[PDB]
Design a protein around this ligand. Structure first.
Ligand SMILES: *[C@@H]1O[C@H](CO)[C@@H](O[C@@H]2O[C@H](CO)[C@@H](O[C@@H]3O[C@H](CO)[C@@H](O)[C@H](O)[C@@H]3O)[C@H](O)[C@H]2NC(C)=O)[C@H](O)[C@H]1NC(C)=O
Ligand SMILES: *[C@@H]1O[C@H](CO)[C@@H](O[C@@H]2O[C@H](CO)[C@@H](O[C@@H]3O[C@H](CO)[C@@H](O)[C@H](O)[C@@H]3O)[C@H](O)[C@H]2NC(C)=O)[C@H](O)[C@H]1NC(C)=O
Ligand SMILES: *[C@@H]1O[C@H](CO)[C@@H](O[C@@H]2O[C@H](CO)[C@@H](O[C@@H]3O[C@H](CO)[C@@H](O)[C@H](O)[C@@H]3O)[C@H](O)[C@H]2NC(C)=O)[C@H](O)[C@H]1NC(C)=O
Lengths: 274, 642, 528, 91
């Protein structure tokens, strides 16, 4: 049901195992978050598994976005800074497409234009009006429930509820004394979760780096990468059945990182728009 | 001995700039002042801190501005009232006072496009977010929409940041929905106790093609008028043309909310050329209550309902005019703008307010005090007449009864009202007073106002008086403060005051002087006055036809609309059919309704003076504290007494 | 008609200004006015009136007016025949044209009427719409009203409620039915008691004076009164402004108490007197609660603790009294010598835990001594007899989290009538014992045993002050001040209400909190 | 002809449309939507008439062309689960 889902494992010297996730975007690249890895983590200590396979695939290089800096706000008293929290993982071996391993489509490409049944003259600004309009957008992400993958349907607060969603970042750990709330929430972000209009399931720490998918006309398009959350409702025992109302989760908008994605995937036959 | 003083408003507001005045009497050389603001209780954090120096060249003055920070210390809702520890240090002397703080961040006004809606339509509504100075600001606002039962249906949490203080919103009406009076409530996130609301009706209807105005010949009804009550029925189309047809008009009496109809008064008149006349006779009215005495109908009101039907039979309109009170006198007298405290030996200025029985002011009505008849003041366009009487230097309460001397009317049909004024308690019975009288006319922006200072005291200590100190209160904030000099021998000095657009709608003016006479004690005598300005816009906004009149335009034709307003202003528009106001003329957004909300949120209660010197400040909405021990009373209620 | 244009401007410098209404009159000379009702019933023959107006000055019109055919209506206008008549309208008059129709299908249908005049190029047409509501009377039926409360009505934390379908055997043929489901949370308002009135506490502002122990009998009702009035917010009904006069009396007793401090960092009644274990420990209890009002030095408070840990603490954790105080009325329930090793150790251990967050960096043996003193109270807690010694040793064990098992059951059952832990003897010790056990009930966060305990302390109306009232004024207004801060206004509302329908595939889940309560969450379903 | 919505509404589709030589308007259909329904606003194609202002779940809309014109597409569309109208857009 979820062929694109990658399971990433990073072994660190006595720090523990970092259980992150990613998305198969091509035959060589796996898109995920950037805070799962640091500069000290070497390529022999990072193992990625896809398709439910027992073996681990070996990687070549982890390509971070050039604007990522997690400790870039320690002068202002902010310990974390998840702006531009995306990274690509170039694998060593080519992936063979079958029934359990298939890619996920990306914004502003040739195949995305035909998947929405649009004319080929559709610009990239016209596609951003289609997938992310100024309303509450129905979406879904992939989570791991008792060694089994399941889907959690959420709503993207992009309309008038975008203001009520973003101002709830003051309750995050370390962000309790942040002056301007827009300093930590750049326009590169999307907001899901909360109580209005529905009770959305929240993302865990193990679901980090996964895709934020939009199901339209029996096809699945990724529009975001899971970044960080205000409240940790998952404790690896169950899901905490009494969540608060300001438990929101933030993602990285893929329409804002397009010149970096077009450069790193220029030799992949994806067909990005001009 | 040098004296240090501090003046601050009664209630300080969150996230707003308040003004602070520092003085130093009988001092030479510069006095450095360090002012530090703390929260109550215990002084946990510094909320504000400012510094200034009082130079003798400025006569030891210096206005200081601060701002209550938007910190989460005022987060508790069980506290009801909030307080701060205000502290000022004059070099080596520390002066402090506890001041009440309200949680209010400003005002919220809700505009709807129509006053009545059908099921299936969509309601458009804007929210204008301003602070206490009527300037736009960005806050977080919670919005509710309530049913006729009072249960909220849809809740939102918007921010007016980066939107120029205008929040466009919408709500769809389902096809199956409850009719009745719906409600839209909104409040600031930091002040949830202050809710602002506007209603609208939901009904199944169609639009009419003509309006019916039911207006009687007088705005009341006199009991002994043998002619009865004459009511004019006006019926014209929406486009201005006149209506031919037939009407059905019936009168009725109303006592409280229990209505008693009068079926004896049914008439059927034809409506010719959009006009018609109908009279209720007095014998029909006295036969409906079964009352042999005619004096028991005083207090009750009358209501008229009309139903005009066209000659084609295609449409009809019901209209109603209610609240026509039955009175013995066509005028009423209210001392609601007149001070309740006087000074013995000095002239007392009465602010007489004369109304029609429906609430409108009366034009050109003589007003003379019963038992005196010296001054016969005439009413202006605002319904205010200016009287003055000479008083004896006695501490007896002054009973003033004021009547009207209108001609073409007998003395039994004249109005009267008696009020009681209490004497001003002096400091130590020294008989040192101060009166403030102002030329009462309609004040417009751009004019100049002559404010008079009258001093009554003994001659042994008038040479010590060299200056007065005036302060301007407007919309709960301090606007301007200065000095007014006086030489020994001058019993009267005049301050010319320029009137800007910032005094709208009204303003209060306080003043005080300070000196030491006989024993070495600092004496403070004060006085206040409330002056109304013409309630108009701060800027201006006119909408007229950009096309040079032409003729009445055709359906489908383009026209040019001229929008005339201030620079850098976001103008929002709405165009409404005038057939909507036939069904519901309630809940229209006007400029006069906006100034009614601002005037009913002022921190001053009594329109003039007080029982003592400290009672003048608390009734006008100010706090005083000095280094010599003289303070004002505490204030723990956000609203006025009673 | 006439349009009334209202405008509002918004300048950042000038502010708000709503314009006067500007009226634009729109009119034609020859037009049709189609006057239609709000709704007509399907298959009911009604008559509609198309009024033709002629506002010309002195020109009569010859007009052919025709109704257009619609398949949703049944009139005389068909597909192969026009329903047109020609009439004559005099000047400055109107003529009504009657038309009969029968609507045939529900929904919003359309009617169009056109007309044109003879020998001139003037014409007009009106196309308006009207609702065709189906036959019958609108009705509603209540299927169920069920009160939702898991754990009470439910089991294991979940509650399942099954809803049957409706009746609808009397439904109109070929009509739409809509089912509305509503969720509504109920607000709760629990706990909270009336605080002791500040008009009853005027007599507690006492100027302290005397020796090393007579200073503390005067310092006690002044320090504890400011602590109680700052939390309950009763400075308005006390009179205000007298806070600064009471803040100077607290600084007066702090200065006189340091004059009897020994060079061993301990306190006695005189400088030539031997140092005392109780007076040094009661100074720590008063000074740690006085850090919120004035200034407190770190070298005297922790030095009193360091003298209590290194000099006057056995490795058992038992604090032994060397020289007792001269004033035996100020010690309260410690005057009765029954279990001196369990009551004096519990008295100092509260002073070490109320100064635990102050002296954690200076005295490194304080996390050790708290562990050493807490282990002695846990062993002999099952052997205590007096109701005061259980209350004083229950609050010393609750601040760490070690009042569980057979020790927690002995703490709750000692209360006679479940409201007071009175001893058989001494009224002052029973008044003090209820406030020690109330402070242990608020540290455990067990809010069920609390409201009968607070209600007994307020109905007794002990306002403090007097001889021997040093412990009795200090503890009753410490527990009643701790009550007003830990009191909730409501119990939890967090309802994970999911709705599974067999018509859909997804579960419709709402979470109702306290702030979003009293807000209906309607979910409409046209399938029964 | 050009399209422009009221305040608080988002315009999707072609804002500027042009009548071509084949008697059809260029671009996509302009839709003013507020984002309050489970399904989006199906909009009004030029020449049609939409009956149904509610855009909730399980709702339906019916379309009718003008006089002498033939409907192509679905006369009735129904909002399905997932936020997608049944049938096809008429013309
Ligand atoms: C507090 O005091 C300061 C300094 O006295 C005030 O600043 C002054 O504000 C006025 C108003 O903008 C400035 O212009 C003046 O306007 C009047 C208008 O009638 C005119 O007659 C004067 O000749 C003058 O041009 C003035 O330049 C400015 N600065 C100084 C040094 O006076 C401030 O307004 C006061 N604030 C409050 C709240 O009282
Ligand atoms: C659907 O069910 C309701 C039952 O609640 C039916 O009765 C309606 O009930 C409401 C609530 O009590 C009434 O509203 C109220 O009317 C009174 C006047 O009696 C007014 O003073 C209140 O302010 C409030 O508006 C409503 O009138 C009433 N409807 C009636 C009497 O026709 C309702 O009739 C049912 N609807 C249908 C279509 O069957
Ligand atoms: C759709 O087409 C319209 C034209 O049909 C485009 O409107 C153009 O918008 C620009 C604004 O960037 C206009 O410039 C301004 O014009 C006003 C005229 O009053 C002038 O005062 C300003 O100084 C400024 O120059 C431009 O005139 C206008 N084009 C025309 C022909 O009037 C619109 O941008 C198009 N939108 C899309 C999404 O394609």
């Amino acid at each position: 049901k979820q062929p694109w889902q990658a399971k990433i494992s990073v072994i660190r010297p006595s720090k523990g195992h970092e259980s992150c996730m990613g998305a198969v975007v091509s035959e060589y690249f796996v898109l995920t978050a950037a805070h799962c890895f640091t500069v000290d983590d070497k390529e022999h200590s990072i193992k990625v598994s896809v398709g439910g396979e027992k073996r681990d695939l070996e990687i070549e290089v982890v390509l971070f976005h050039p604007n990522y800096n997690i400790n870039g706000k320690k002068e202002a008293g902010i310990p974390e800074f998840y702006d531009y929290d995306v990274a690509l993982i170039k694998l060593k071996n080519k992936l063979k497409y079958g029934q359990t391993i298939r890619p996920i489509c990306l914004p502003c490409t040739e195949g995305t234009t035909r998947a929405l049944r649009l004319p080929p003259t559709t610009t990239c600004q016209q596609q951003k009006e289609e997938l992310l309009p100024a309303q509450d957008i129905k979406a879904l992400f992939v989570s791991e429930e008792e060694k089994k993958l399941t889907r959690k349907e959420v709503y993207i607060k992009n309309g008038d509820k975008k203001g009520s969603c973003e101002r709830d970042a003051q309750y995050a750990p370390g962000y309790d004394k942040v002056k301007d709330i827009s300093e930590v929430v750049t326009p590169r972000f999307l907001c899901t979760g909360g109580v209005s209009p529905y009770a959305d399931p929240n993302t865990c720490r193990g679901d980090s780096g996964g895709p934020l998918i939009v199901h339209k006309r029996s096809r699945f398009i990724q529009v975001g990468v899971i970044s960080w959350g205000v409240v940790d409702v998952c404790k690896n025992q169950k899901r905490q059945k009494q969540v608060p109302a300001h438990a929101r989760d933030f993602h990285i908008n893929l329409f804002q990182v397009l010149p970096w994605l077009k450069e790193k995937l220029q030799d992949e036959d994806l067909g990005f728009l001009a | 001995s040098p004296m240090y003083s501090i003046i601050t408003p009664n209630i300080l507001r969150l996230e707003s700039e308040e003004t602070m005045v520092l003085e130093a009497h009988d001092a030479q050389g510069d006095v450095p002042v360090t002012v530090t603001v703390h929260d109550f209780p215990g002084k946990k954090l510094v909320l504000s801190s400012e510094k200034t120096v009082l130079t003798p060249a400025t006569n030891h003055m210096g206005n200081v501005t601060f701002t209550i920070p938007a910190n989460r210390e005022f987060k508790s809702e069980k506290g009801r009232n909030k307080f701060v520890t205000v502290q000022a240090t004059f070099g080596t002397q520390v002066v402090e006072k506890v001041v009440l703080v309200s949680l209010q961040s400003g005002y919220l006004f809700i505009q709807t496009d129509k006053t009545i809606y059908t099921p299936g339509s969509t309601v458009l509504y804007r929210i204008f977010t301003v602070n206490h100075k009527l300037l736009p600001v960005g806050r977080t606002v919670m919005v509710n929409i309530e049913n006729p039962e009072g249960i909220p249906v849809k809740q939102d949490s918007l921010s007016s940041q980066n939107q120029l203080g205008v929040l466009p919103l919408s709500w769809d009406i389902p096809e199956l929905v409850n009719m009745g009076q719906w409600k839209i409530r909104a409040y600031y996130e930091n002040s949830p106790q202050q809710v602002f609301s506007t209603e609208f009706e939901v009904k199944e209807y169609v639009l009419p093609s003509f309006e019916v105005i039911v207006e009687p010949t007088e705005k009341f009804y006199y009991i002994y008028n043998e002619k009865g009550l004459e009511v004019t029925i006006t019926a014209r189309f929406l486009y201005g043309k006149k209506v031919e047809g037939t009407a059905f008009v019936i009168f009725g009496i109303q006592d409280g909310e229990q209505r008693i109809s009068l079926p004896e008064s049914l008439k059927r008149i034809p409506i010719e050329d959009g006009s018609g006349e109908v009279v209720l006779s007095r014998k029909v009215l006295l036969d409906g209550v079964q009352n042999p005495r005619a004096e028991d109908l005083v207090g009750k009101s009358l209501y008229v309902s009309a139903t005009v039907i066209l000659h084609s039979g295609s449409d009809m309109v019901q209209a109603e005019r209610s609240g026509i009170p039955i009175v013995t006198s066509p005028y009423q007298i209210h001392f609601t703008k007149t001070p309740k405290y006087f000074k013995p030996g000095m002239p007392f200025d009465l602010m007489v307010f004369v109304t029609n029985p429906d609430g409108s002011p009366a034009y050109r009505v003589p007003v003379a005090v019963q038992g005196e008849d010296t001054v016969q003041s005439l009413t202006q366009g605002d319904g205010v007449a200016k009287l003055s009487i000479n008083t004896h230097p006695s501490q007896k309460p002054l009973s003033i009864t004021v009547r009207t001397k209108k001609q073409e009317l007998s003395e039994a049909e004249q109005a009267t009202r008696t009020m009681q004024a209490l004497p001003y308690s002096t400091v130590g019975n020294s008989n040192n007073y101060l009166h403030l009288s102002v030329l009462r006319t309609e004040l417009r922006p751009g004019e100049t106002l002559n404010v008079n200072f009258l001093l009554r005291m003994d001659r042994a200590h008038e040479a010590k008086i060299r200056y007065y100190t005036y302060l301007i209160m407007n919309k709960g904030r301090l606007l301007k403060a200065g000095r007014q000099v006086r030489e020994p021998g001058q019993d009267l000095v005049v301050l010319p005051l320029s009137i800007t657009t910032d005094f709208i709608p009204s303003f209060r003016l306080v003043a005080y002087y300070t000196l030491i006479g006989a024993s070495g004690q600092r004496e403070v005598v004060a006085d206040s006055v409330w002056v109304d300005v013409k309630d108009s816009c701060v800027g201006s906004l006119v909408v007229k036809s950009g096309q040079s009149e032409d003729r009445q335009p055709v359906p489908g034709q383009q026209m040019t609309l001229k929008i005339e307003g201030d620079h850098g202003a976001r103008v929002v528009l709405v165009a409404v059919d005038k057939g909507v106001f036939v069904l519901n003329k309630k809940n229209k957004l006007t400029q006069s309704k906006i100034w009614d909300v601002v005037e009913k949120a002022d921190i001053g209660c009594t329109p003039g003076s007080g029982k003592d010197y400290a009672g003048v400040f608390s009734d006008a909405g100010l706090t005083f504290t000095s280094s010599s021990g003289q303070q004002t009373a505490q204030r723990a209620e956000l609203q006025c007494p009673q | 008609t006439t349009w009334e244009i209202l405008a509002v401007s918004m300048s950042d410098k000038k502010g708000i200004c709503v314009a006067d209404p500007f009226e634009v009159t729109v009119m034609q000379d020859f037009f049709i006015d189609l006057r239609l009702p709000y709704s007509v019933v399907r298959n009911e023959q009604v008559e509609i009136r198309a009024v033709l107006y002629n506002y010309r000055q002195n020109q009569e019109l010859k007009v052919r007016v025709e109704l257009l055919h619609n398949p949703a209506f049944c009139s005389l206008a068909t597909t192969k025949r026009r329903h047109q008549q020609t009439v004559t309208i005099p000047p400055k008059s109107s003529l009504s044209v009657p038309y009969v129709i029968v609507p045939l299908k529900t929904g919003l249908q359309e009617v169009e009427v056109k007309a044109a005049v003879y020998h001139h190029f003037i014409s007009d047409g009106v196309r308006k719409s009207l609702k065709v509501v189906p036959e019958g009377i609108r009705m509603n039926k209540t299927v169920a009203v069920r009160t939702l409360d898991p754990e009470r009505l439910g089991r294991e934390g979940v509650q399942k409620e099954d809803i049957p379908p409706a009746d609808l055997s009397d439904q109109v043929p070929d009509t739409e039915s809509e089912t509305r489901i509503l969720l509504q949370g109920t607000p709760v308002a629990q706990m909270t008691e009336d605080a002791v009135d500040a008009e009853r506490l005027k007599h507690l502002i006492v100027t302290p004076s005397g020796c090393g122990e007579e200073n503390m009998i005067g310092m006690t009702p002044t320090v504890i009164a400011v602590h109680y009035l700052d939390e309950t917010e009763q400075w308005e009904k006390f009179g205000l402004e007298k806070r600064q006069g009471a803040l100077e009396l607290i600084k007066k007793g702090y200065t006189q108490q340091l004059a009897f401090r020994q060079p061993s960092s301990a306190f006695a009644a005189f400088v030539k007197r031997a140092p005392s274990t109780w007076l040094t420990a009661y100074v720590v209890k008063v000074f740690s609660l006085a850090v919120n009002l004035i200034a407190i030095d770190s070298q005297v408070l922790c030095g009193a603790v360091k003298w209590l840990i290194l000099e006057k603490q056995k490795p058992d954790g038992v604090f032994q009294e060397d020289a007792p105080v001269i004033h035996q009325e100020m010690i309260g329930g410690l005057r009765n010598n029954n279990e001196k090793d369990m009551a004096l150790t519990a008295f100092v251990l509260i002073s070490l835990q109320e100064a635990k967050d102050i002296c954690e960096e200076q005295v490194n043996s304080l996390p050790g001594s708290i562990t050493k003193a807490g282990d002695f109270l846990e062993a002999n807690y099952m052997n205590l007899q007096r109701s005061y010694t259980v209350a004083i040793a229950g609050y010393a064990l609750a601040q760490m989290g070690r009042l569980k098992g057979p020790l927690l059951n002995k703490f709750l059952t000692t209360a006679k009538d479940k409201n007071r832990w009175e001893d058989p003897g001494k009224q002052l010790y029973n008044v003090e014992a209820t406030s020690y056990a109330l402070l242990a009930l608020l540290q455990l966060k067990d809010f069920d045993f609390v409201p009968p305990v607070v209600r007994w302390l307020n109905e007794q109306r002990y306002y403090g002050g007097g001889y021997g009232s040093t412990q009795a004024t200090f503890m009753v207004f410490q527990a009643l001040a701790q009550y007003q801060k830990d009191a909730p206004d409501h119990q939890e509302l967090n309802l994970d209400v999911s709705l599974q329908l067999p018509s859909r595939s997804s579960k419709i889940t709402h979470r109702i909190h306290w702030e979003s309560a009293s807000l209906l969450r309607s979910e409409e379903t046209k399938e029964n | 002809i050009s399209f422009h919505c009221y305040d608080g509404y988002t315009l999707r589709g072609s804002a500027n449309r042009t009548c071509q030589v084949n008697g059809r308007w260029s671009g996509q259909t302009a839709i003013c939507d507020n984002g309050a329904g489970y399904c989006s606003n199906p909009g009004i194609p030029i020449g049609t008439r939409k009956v149904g202002s509610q855009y909730r779940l399980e709702d339906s809309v019916t379309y009718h062309c003008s006089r002498g014109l033939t409907l192509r597409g679905s006369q009735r569309r129904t909002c399905q689960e997932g936020g997608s109208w049944s049938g096809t857009e008429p013309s």
